[model samples]
Target chain A: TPQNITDLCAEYHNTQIHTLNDKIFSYTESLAGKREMAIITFKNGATFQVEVPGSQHIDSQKKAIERMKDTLRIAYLTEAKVEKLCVWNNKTPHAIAAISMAN
Target chain B: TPQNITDLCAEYHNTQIHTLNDKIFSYTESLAGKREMAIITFKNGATFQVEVPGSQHIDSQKKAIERMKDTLRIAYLTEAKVEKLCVWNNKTPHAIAAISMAN
Candidate 1:
């Protein structure tokens, strides 16, 4: 799941890079100081954070998750990432019985 | 320097959290797994990535830096962050004399 990418990033140094409409972006996590942080960047050149480290408040975590979901929305507007998003939405747990091919 | 926040974030898991007009944002770096990633999040909420790790290319690194600079522009659109932005522009590294006070 696309969300899993960020989940792993929250704990380990995980990354997922994709490009669409000539734009590239990445999802990353940093946990090397007084606070743990999550970040996402836009390829056309924009970067911001879902987590901040200054006297950790529980509310910050909730805000981070909230923002992460929002970011994915912008990313979905692109081509490369929607692939992952599409897979995430069109899933079945019972069994696999068909082909999933793409261009 | 405002850029320093990202410089440290690039190497360590440095995070900068600032709030303006009810919007909270963060800048962070994650060097956790096989690939190093840089991310930025907007509090209203949007998140994206400037770096991706899957057999990187020199071009990708260039894009990351170029994009990081661009992301700052969006972040500068707030009161809290613009404070740092203003300080960065109105700097005198040689020496300090008068008061650098603010409201």
Candidate 2:
């Protein structure tokens, strides 16, 4: 039987979400400082880490987010298609916490 | 006059894409080196700068992507909601270049 491609897409989407959620948990489990970061994962298992200024530093945070977004958009458009993109907040040095795609 | 919220969302979405494209252009105008970076800007005009290893460095790229995505995701979920997310590449030091959300 032919499987629906959309179904596969939906499935892959869910898998990525699940993986990202788990990553967020451990990544923020013991934050070292206040910073915003993201994890980009490709189907080939290739991964990358990018950061932005934490929310506390509004100016820095804005700058960092643009920088990170540039990387994400570029990678996404180029041959290195991102399979999963996850972002989080490590509100450490302030308190233990975690924020994900939807907070 | 009252307007449809969905329409507003759609309009905002396009505005974001357009804004991101422009950012990508200037950001990569004169890359000093091969690096993956993004310019995160907020509605308030606040900005932040973040970076990750370029594609030339796969392992580092992977790590950086993860960190970057974490930041994006967390911001999206938290009160620091991302109005627009964009990514790009500066293939400089090798050659002048640019990449965006859809390549």
Best by TM-score: 1
After superposition, which runs of candidate 2 have C-alpha atoms over 4 Å from their true positions? A1-57, A88-103, B1-103
Give lDDT: candidate 1, residue A46: 44
The models' CA-based lDDT, in order, is 0.32, 0.32
Where does the lowest 10-residue lDDT sum fall in candidate 2 chain A?
A24-33
Query: lDDT, candidate 2, residue B37?
Result: 53
DockQ of each: 0.02, 0.02
lDDT of 1 by residue, A16-84 (tens): 322222332776666678445544455665444444423323432343343343344344344222211
**lDDT tens per residue, model 1, B15-95:** 332323332254333322232333334455544344332343376554555355345423422322332111121212111
In angstroms and one decimal each, the interface RMSD of every candidate reads: 15.2, 16.9
Candidate 2 lDDT score at position B41: 50
